[PDB]
Design a protein around this motif. Structure first.
Motif, PDB file in Angstrom:
ATOM      1  N   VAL A 228       2.689   6.476 -30.001  1.00 22.90           N
ATOM      2  CA  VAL A 228       2.021   5.671 -29.013  1.00 22.90           C
ATOM      3  C   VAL A 228       1.257   4.564 -29.744  1.00 22.90           C
ATOM      4  CG1 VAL A 228       0.682   5.808 -26.869  1.00 22.90           C
ATOM      5  CG2 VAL A 228       1.600   7.893 -27.871  1.00 22.90           C
ATOM      6  N   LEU A 229       1.195   3.396 -29.120  1.00 26.72           N
ATOM      7  CA  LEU A 229       0.432   2.266 -29.608  1.00 26.72           C
ATOM      8  C   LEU A 229      -0.501   1.879 -28.511  1.00 26.72           C
ATOM      9  CD1 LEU A 229       3.752   0.765 -30.459  1.00 26.72           C
ATOM     10  CD2 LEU A 229       2.047   0.959 -32.243  1.00 26.72           C
ATOM     11  N   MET A 230      -1.579   1.180 -28.837  1.00 17.86           N
ATOM     12  CA  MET A 230      -2.549   0.757 -27.817  1.00 17.86           C
ATOM     13  C   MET A 230      -1.956   0.001 -26.636  1.00 17.86           C
ATOM     14  SD  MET A 230      -5.579   1.434 -27.829  1.00 17.86           S
ATOM     15  CE  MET A 230      -7.243   1.284 -28.447  1.00 17.86           C
TER      16      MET A 230
ATOM     17  N   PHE B 119      -0.905   1.948 -23.275  1.00 16.10           N
ATOM     18  CA  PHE B 119      -1.765   2.465 -22.244  1.00 16.10           C
ATOM     19  C   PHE B 119      -1.789   1.540 -21.036  1.00 16.10           C
ATOM     20  CE2 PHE B 119      -4.218   4.487 -25.912  1.00 16.10           C
ATOM     21  CZ  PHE B 119      -3.618   5.711 -25.749  1.00 16.10           C
TER      22      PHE B 119
ATOM     23  N   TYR C 227       3.344  11.665 -24.515  1.00 11.53           N
ATOM     24  CA  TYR C 227       2.564  12.152 -25.635  1.00 11.53           C
ATOM     25  C   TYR C 227       1.676  13.255 -25.086  1.00 11.53           C
ATOM     26  CZ  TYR C 227      -0.865  12.325 -29.450  1.00 11.53           C
ATOM     27  OH  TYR C 227      -1.670  12.753 -30.483  1.00 11.53           O
TER      28      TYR C 227
ATOM     29  N   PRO D   6      -7.449   5.703 -23.640  1.00 12.77           N
ATOM     30  CA  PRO D   6      -7.648   5.730 -25.081  1.00 12.77           C
ATOM     31  C   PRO D   6      -8.738   6.713 -25.570  1.00 12.77           C
ATOM     32  CG  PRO D   6      -7.379   3.507 -24.306  1.00 12.77           C
ATOM     33  CD  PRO D   6      -7.615   4.352 -23.099  1.00 12.77           C
ATOM     34  N   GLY D   7      -9.785   6.916 -24.783  1.00 14.39           N
ATOM     35  CA  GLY D   7     -10.808   7.916 -25.137  1.00 14.39           C
ATOM     36  C   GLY D   7     -10.266   9.310 -24.956  1.00 14.39           C
TER      37      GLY D   7
ATOM     38  N   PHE E 224      -7.235  10.015 -25.437  1.00 15.65           N
ATOM     39  CA  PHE E 224      -6.420  10.199 -26.619  1.00 15.65           C
ATOM     40  C   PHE E 224      -7.314  10.551 -27.808  1.00 15.65           C
ATOM     41  CE2 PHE E 224      -4.701   8.938 -30.557  1.00 15.65           C
ATOM     42  CZ  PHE E 224      -3.347   9.168 -30.494  1.00 15.65           C
ATOM     43  N   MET E 225      -8.407   9.830 -27.970  1.00 20.12           N
ATOM     44  CA  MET E 225      -9.300  10.115 -29.079  1.00 20.12           C
ATOM     45  C   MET E 225      -9.889  11.497 -28.936  1.00 20.12           C
ATOM     46  SD  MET E 225     -11.178   6.493 -29.722  1.00 20.12           S
ATOM     47  CE  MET E 225     -12.429   7.302 -30.738  1.00 20.12           C
TER      48      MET E 225
ATOM     49  N   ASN F 260      -7.047  14.459 -29.922  1.00 22.64           N
ATOM     50  CA  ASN F 260      -6.737  14.467 -31.326  1.00 22.64           C
ATOM     51  C   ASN F 260      -7.941  14.872 -32.166  1.00 22.64           C
ATOM     52  OD1 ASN F 260      -4.371  12.352 -30.413  1.00 22.64           O
ATOM     53  ND2 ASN F 260      -3.977  13.294 -32.408  1.00 22.64           N
ATOM     54  N   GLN F 261      -9.093  15.036 -31.546  1.00 17.85           N
ATOM     55  CA  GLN F 261     -10.247  15.473 -32.285  1.00 17.85           C
ATOM     56  C   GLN F 261     -10.802  16.790 -31.791  1.00 17.85           C
ATOM     57  OE1 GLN F 261     -12.622  11.362 -32.322  1.00 17.85           O
ATOM     58  NE2 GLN F 261     -13.263  12.810 -33.900  1.00 17.85           N
TER      59      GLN F 261
ATOM     60  N   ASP G  81     -17.839  13.780 -33.110  1.00 17.45           N
ATOM     61  CA  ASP G  81     -16.560  13.039 -32.993  1.00 17.45           C
ATOM     62  C   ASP G  81     -16.730  11.556 -32.734  1.00 17.45           C
ATOM     63  OD1 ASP G  81     -14.598  15.557 -31.147  1.00 17.45           O
ATOM     64  OD2 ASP G  81     -16.001  15.769 -32.797  1.00 17.45           O
ATOM     65  N   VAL G  82     -15.679  10.808 -32.964  1.00 20.78           N
ATOM     66  CA  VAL G  82     -15.728   9.383 -32.763  1.00 20.78           C
ATOM     67  C   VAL G  82     -15.411   9.101 -31.293  1.00 20.78           C
ATOM     68  CG1 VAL G  82     -15.055   7.176 -33.805  1.00 20.78           C
ATOM     69  CG2 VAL G  82     -14.621   9.291 -35.041  1.00 20.78           C
TER      70      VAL G  82
ATOM     71  N   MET H  75     -14.792   5.596 -28.529  1.00 22.13           N
ATOM     72  CA  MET H  75     -14.414   4.175 -28.567  1.00 22.13           C
ATOM     73  C   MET H  75     -15.562   3.210 -28.831  1.00 22.13           C
ATOM     74  SD  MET H  75     -11.520   3.078 -28.331  1.00 22.13           S
ATOM     75  CE  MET H  75     -10.020   2.714 -27.440  1.00 22.13           C
TER      76      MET H  75
ATOM     77  N   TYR I  35     -15.185   9.189 -40.351  1.00 21.89           N
ATOM     78  CA  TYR I  35     -14.018   9.903 -39.871  1.00 21.89           C
ATOM     79  C   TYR I  35     -12.887   9.556 -40.823  1.00 21.89           C
ATOM     80  CZ  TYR I  35     -10.078  11.319 -36.902  1.00 21.89           C
ATOM     81  OH  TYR I  35      -8.940  11.927 -36.422  1.00 21.89           O
TER      82      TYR I  35
ATOM     83  N   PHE J 228      -6.722   4.262 -35.925  1.00 21.08           N
ATOM     84  CA  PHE J 228      -7.037   5.629 -35.570  1.00 21.08           C
ATOM     85  C   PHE J 228      -5.820   6.284 -34.917  1.00 21.08           C
ATOM     86  CE2 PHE J 228      -8.112   8.894 -32.699  1.00 21.08           C
ATOM     87  CZ  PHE J 228      -9.172   9.576 -33.248  1.00 21.08           C
ATOM     88  N   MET J 229      -5.185   5.582 -33.997  1.00 17.28           N
ATOM     89  CA  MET J 229      -4.019   6.145 -33.340  1.00 17.28           C
ATOM     90  C   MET J 229      -2.911   6.373 -34.341  1.00 17.28           C
ATOM     91  SD  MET J 229      -3.942   4.169 -29.715  1.00 17.28           S
ATOM     92  CE  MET J 229      -2.251   4.726 -29.427  1.00 17.28           C
TER      93      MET J 229
ATOM     94  N   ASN K 280      -3.712   9.757 -36.735  1.00 15.47           N
ATOM     95  CA  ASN K 280      -3.625  10.982 -35.988  1.00 15.47           C
ATOM     96  C   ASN K 280      -2.206  11.247 -35.506  1.00 15.47           C
ATOM     97  OD1 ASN K 280      -6.844  10.444 -35.489  1.00 15.47           O
ATOM     98  ND2 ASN K 280      -6.250  12.575 -35.130  1.00 15.47           N
ATOM     99  N   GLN K 281      -1.303  10.309 -35.714  1.00 10.65           N
ATOM    100  CA  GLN K 281       0.065  10.535 -35.327  1.00 10.65           C
ATOM    101  C   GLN K 281       1.026  10.480 -36.493  1.00 10.65           C
ATOM    102  OE1 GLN K 281       0.187   7.646 -31.561  1.00 10.65           O
ATOM    103  NE2 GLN K 281       1.794   9.201 -31.583  1.00 10.65           N
TER     104      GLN K 281
END
Lengths: 303, 303
Positions: A29-31, A34, A70, A127-128, A130-131, A134-135, B28-29, B31, B70, B130-131, B134-135
């Motif tokens: 996935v890329l930004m 979304f 994803y 995107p959050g 997603f963040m 993954n965390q 955690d991080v 956005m 991170y 970041f994306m 994590n991928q």
């Protein structure tokens, strides 16, 4: 047949949208992903689509296709199972007060309806989300599997597909819906004439004054990801969400817990997320989320 | 002493910035974190800071602190080691044509200088970075450890801290810098009067006409993450980056490779990233990145 018209298009819409995604090879996935919104139109007699008693004439839009494959993948939802459960087995309606609330035959998927506002929102918060996945692997947040829109004779029904915490596979003896507040937070008379009713805060404090007990290891973990989920939610200026909790007095994917002297399988997750920033103060959502965890530790108790 | 003035502030700036981050507990991080810019001012005789022959008078800004802890963590850079290597051992300068190019004593960190443009850029591209991590765990992209700015007597030197592909730990017999193009892509006379010179495309095609051979398993993997990195880079409208390649004729973190009949430890990574969208066509960066991989598979060969 407002409903049967929707019910079919959703099944027909996903088969195509997702079916045809599976021919293409997977790629990260890329930004940019979304924000995409792929569409396709469903006439009665369209070659490359299909006809239908359901499909009279409509267009079907799917938001952020590649992000959702994803997210499915990460949730462990094999796509064959996804579109079997949804598109191949007659999904079933459900009253829950124009918005509908369908469920899969296997009862592993909820299909909700959402307003333009709440939907565009969800979209911005991918995107959050997603963040987060993954965390924080053990995130008590809603598991969003898909976001679509059935445009029907000049009107848009947008819908969200997601998990269904308490599925029916394991029976629920007790259900609580908890915000950490109190006001008019009892069950309606109608509600307690259910079999396995969904009680609320005040109910919980008199019916479960002894907490729900957990061993230091299991409690630590829970505290930890409440705190984290709440930090995320806060970040997005979100409030009025609750902790749905399924008690089972004993694939046990629950936690080890205890009543006032007995073995348990609790089952929990945060719900009613999509509501934020539209007159509350700039520090309100923070206050809401502190109250939350601090309260969920008179609900889930230790030692 | 433009340099010694910088050299010290960077060491003094990081000790504080990162030192004081380590007292706070990790979380955690989000956005929001990618856009933060924390600052602190460094007078001679400031209690809570320190004085200095270096620190005459300046302000030190660190961008996206929490994202970079991170990213460090994910790169396996224990912060004690980070700020020992940088702030505790005299880092050393290096000519490489106002921009400087320092290196750590241990030679595990490059400290580059970057212009306002190239720096704000990097900043915007953190969420994709970041994306990516994590991928794609094996990503040949640059490892960005930190981004700071030493504001000095009414002028800003901004700097980037990052990995250093070919460190000196293992010796490099051969170095290539490769773009997949050809034009004026030979080494300067000066360059080949080095010991272990950095040759380029045309050089590589006459000096290594037999490729660099890899076994199907190792090649597959490499192809795979070139393709992926290139898709990312393309996404960000980036070009004029090269594949830096360290050949070692044999903690061997390299790949299994072969010359025209001998054992090897190659060492590679993509470089010179921060340059994009400021008159190239909308499909240029795509073309650039196709050329790239397609060419790196006359460079890295199979069977």
């Amino acid at each position: 047949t407002t409903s049967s018209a929707l019910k079919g298009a959703i099944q027909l819409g996903i088969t195509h949208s997702v079916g045809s995604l599976s021919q293409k090879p997977e790629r990260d996935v890329l930004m940019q992903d979304f924000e995409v919104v792929e569409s396709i139109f469903f006439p009665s007699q369209g070659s490359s689509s299909t006809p239908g008693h359901h499909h009279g004439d409509f267009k079907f839009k799917t938001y952020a296709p590649i992000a959702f494959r994803y997210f499915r993948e990460m949730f462990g939802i094999r796509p064959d199972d996804y579109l079997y459960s949804l598109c191949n087995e007659p999904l079933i309606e459900l009253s829950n007060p124009g918005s509908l609330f369908y469920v899969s035959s296997d009862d592993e998927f909820i299909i909700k309806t959402v307003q333009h506002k709440e939907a565009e929102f969800l979209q911005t918060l991918l995107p959050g989300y997603f963040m987060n996945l993954n965390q924080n692997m053990r995130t008590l947040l809603p598991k969003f599997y898909g976001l679509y829109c059935v445009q029907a004779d000049g009107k848009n029904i947008r819908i969200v597909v997601m998990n269904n915490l308490l599925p029916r596979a394991v029976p629920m003896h007790l259900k609580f819906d908890l915000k950490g507040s109190t006001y008019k937070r009892r069950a309606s008379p109608k509600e307690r004439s259910k079999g396995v009713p969904t009680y609320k805060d005040l109910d919980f404090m008199q019916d479960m004054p002894e907490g729900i007990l957990l061993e230091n290891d299991h409690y630590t973990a829970l505290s930890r990801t409440m705190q984290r989920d709440c930090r995320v939610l806060q970040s997005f200026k979100i409030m009025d969400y609750s902790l749905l909790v399924g008690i089972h007095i004993l694939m046990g994917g629950i936690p080890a817990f205890n009543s006032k002297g007995e073995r348990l399988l609790v089952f929990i997750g945060i719900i009613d997320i999509l509501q934020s920033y539209r007159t509350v103060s700039v520090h309100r959502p923070s206050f809401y989320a502190d109250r939350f965890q601090k309260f969920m530790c008179s609900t889930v108790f230790r030692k």
